[PDB]
Amino acid sequence: MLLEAIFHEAKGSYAYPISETQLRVRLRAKKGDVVRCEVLYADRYASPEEELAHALAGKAGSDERFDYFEALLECSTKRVKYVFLLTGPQGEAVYFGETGFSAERSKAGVFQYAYIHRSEVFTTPEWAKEAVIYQIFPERFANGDPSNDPPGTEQWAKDARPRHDSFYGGDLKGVIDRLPYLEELGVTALYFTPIFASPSHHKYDTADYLAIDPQFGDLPTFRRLVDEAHRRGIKIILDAVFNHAGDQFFAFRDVLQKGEQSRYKDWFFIEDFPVSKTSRTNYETFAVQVPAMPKLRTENPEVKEYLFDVARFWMEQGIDGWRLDVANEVDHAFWREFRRLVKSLNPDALIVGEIWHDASGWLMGDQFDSVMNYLFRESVIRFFATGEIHAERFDAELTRARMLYPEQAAQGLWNLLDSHDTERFLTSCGGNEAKFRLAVLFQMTYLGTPLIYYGDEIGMAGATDPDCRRPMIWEEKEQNRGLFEFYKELIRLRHRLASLTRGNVRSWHADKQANLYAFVRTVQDQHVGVVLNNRGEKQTVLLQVPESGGKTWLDCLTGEEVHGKQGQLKLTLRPYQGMILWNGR
Template sequence: MNKQAIIHRPTDQHAYVCADNSVNIMIQTQKGDCKGIHFIHGDPYDWEEKKWKNKKIAMRKTGTDQLYDYWQVTIKPASHRLRYGFKLNDGENPLYFGEGGFSAQEPNDIAFYFCIPYVHVSDAFQAPAWVKNTVWYQIFPERFANGNTKNDPKDTLAWGSSEPTADNFFGGDLQGVIEQISYLKELGITGLYFTPIFKAYSNHKYDTIDYLEIDPQFGDKETLKQLIKVCHDNGIKVMLDAVFNHSGFYFPLFQDVVEKGEKSKYKDWFHIHDFPLIFEPKPNYDTFAFTPFMPKLNTQNEEVRNYLLNVGRYWVEEFDIDGWRLDVANEVDHGFWRDFHKVVKGIKPDLYILGEIWHDAMPWLRGDQFDAVMNYPFTRNILDLFAKESIDRKTFAENMTAVIHMYPASIHTNAFNLVGSHDTPRILHECSGDKRKVQQIFTFLLTFIGTPCIYYGDEIGIDGDGDPGCRKCMIWDEEQQDRHMLEHVRKLITLRKNHPLLANEGNLSFLPVEMNSHCFAFMKEKQDKTIIVIFNLSDQEEQFTLPAHQNRQMPIDLWTGNKVKDKKIPLEARGFSILEF
């Protein structure tokens, strides 16, 4: 057995407390190296005749990626204390593994074993319960709907009359969203994520001028209050976008530094290398990327911290928002985010805190900072398989298994899953215009674990390259909408709501890939119910053979409502099937 590939530490995704006082344990072994693992556990103070009393329970293999097998077990220690280790079986000689290393014989010294001194339920990661049942819709306010032409910026263009650019305006506002709530409700949306609505110079508003004011082109605070009330009355949560990593160039305090230089009392609000300030070709102060128009805020400065914490507090207290999405969250110090968590959760405990992090985000997901991050590893794998066809089915399943095992299971139900945003090309563009691929991607997104998000207009077939092409005006003329795509998405959302196994219930696993096929499937199981979601990646009709333990049952195809009478499931080209057993 390859000892170097055996990985476990009593922390993070490998060992964590759950809200019901249980403990989830995971261990990784080299792929195919281990036939089974028994979990050895007991109270460190429970001895009999000078021998430590412990129990052994078989662990469940929960997935395989390109390098590792993953094994898990969940137990509820009777005494809240836990010493534990592993008995690994390769079919020949057992191997014992604990904090003390490896042993060919079962150690009796509890110092050999891993330790959880006491199970405190207060240490459990607990995201808001409502999030796992939410289907989000991302709105770029300037391009969604123009409900009040009186607040249009100067030189506003007629709606949709031109391609989007980095600096043109079409007049989208909050009133426009209010007027389209019925559209969103009929689609099945239960959460709105708005890109920034605070006063800023640009059309995207990520260059904040005033964190405590609505941008006049979007309306005023009364309009926002009305919007939030209408949303709440219709069962829709509201999440705003905050940019605490950097301000805008025209943020008054940065302008004070521009004007007064080293004499400005706000110079320490930013990361300035030296004076005088230099803007081109490269600024001599830290920024978002290297743009001089977004100076980085110094969150180590107490005045800055207090100012931004007050911003977080204000919009929760005064407007009863349901979530904060935090821009460039990985470049802000952890101490600030811990303070932010305390402040906003102290006001509204079930507030959703979502960080924009594009990579492994475990350091932010330990329960004291964020509830979730934008799940871009999920996005990349989806696009690579369905849209770009740059990976095969086996690699996809292995990659997704690795993503699933990056974090504790309690985090996955709140993971913000997306396939497009204001930062990425439109999903239809990624699929080179193939709407069958888009439908498959939406099917995967809306039947997988996590909390899915639809980027405005993707559901009606809006196309567009990356920024600014992905920021086109929403199309409201039904004759110009892809109504077939809209109905496809609406039906998937309805199925997700009516069948908990299509959302965040049950245990998920990928079925073995058949080499002579272009199909793949994943399965969700809970007690006496199973759902299998199958995809055909070929441009030809294919058949998928049900697993042996399932093919004696007669499932129902939830998409068509028909009973399936054969163990071979026909799938049209680029088609899918959702079977319930």
């Protein structure tokens, strides 16, 4: 077997604590090479004479190239050393440890997890495990207060096409007013795009961190909002824009005015004085040449103390946590201290970073609780929208992504389809509703936390920003109620079936040919099995279901009852149909 494909490291995603006395460990091997992975382990100081402990590692998944193996170590002493025993299909045995490979245990050496610290156990808020989140881009959700509408507000109609600088009048009073709609949908948290004083429709160039933007409301309206949402089981997440200020931020105005007399010059990244050249800015901005968005020097303890003060302020209004804009471009120390502070004020405050690539380095337990899982979105796109990948690549892409982080992270990754920075997911499906609903079914059943983007639930389309930000369709007639009852129904299932909010995932069937993908959520003895017929025609499948997992299932959407003769389940799906099979437990 291929030793060049064998991997483990006693840290990160490969070895990490689940409590104070148990370590999770993972090994990856060329797909097919190992058939048995066993951990032989002991206290770090055990005498060379005491017997090893055994823990046999099940295969938790496979991608394009690897199999992944997973085991739980029971470490009373909280200090472990161990070695893997791998066995190939012909019964070849090799010992894998820190020192290397060898047929002699001893010669493999031992990886070591020196010590489990209670404070180093990744722990996330419980409500997040089983939440569904709704993203509101306030400027375009609901105009409930016409008197606070910005100048030149265009008209709020069924098919306005917004320009980069448009205003439609959405505000906070409109959220308050639409809360029954939200509660009826079944959402349990709201993700607000930025809502602090800024002169733009997105408000990502902050004028004032400590004020509601006047055309969104005032602080009393916000408090009225937090409570009104809270009494309906809805939390409030706010968008913390800490990477950069807007060009009207007090300190930066100081800087434009006083040049290098400003007490605030080292709060920014000023290339030379006077600060301002437009089409050529002489200061570093978000992205490239974005004069409204000078980068904040978060490494500056003054800059840091100030944003910490912001975070406290809003947290005293009772919000429920943060979404961290361009988070991967502010330093790690900032984020570790931000967590120490945030968790200290509210152990249940959630923290979610806006990073699009491999966020493994902010998801070890000391920074973010979760991220907007744009990876999740990529696989979803290329599988149900564009169809670039078939069912077996999809499975690899899902799994490989699943193994990237500690479980505590993957349990509450924000799995979206689209956002305010993206074309709408119906649009990626070229308007094909049938493919869309399958992507929604998938989303509402897969591991992680579903994020809805205001509007998707009733049919809204659009190309990418600023077209993905149209005014929300509110006229019953103009809305896809069929799709709305669909989200509603899916959301209640998610709430009833613990398995869907808390169970794990294992691939159940994956056939590149039929393009029929299935997976299984399990918590305790509950098995829910989801099947996806992502094909234009109608097909049949024989799913391997052993007698142990139950032999009778109930299809949750239709009520249909299904039966397994002989370790097998025969199933006939309709074009783009999905089934959600509860094993009755």
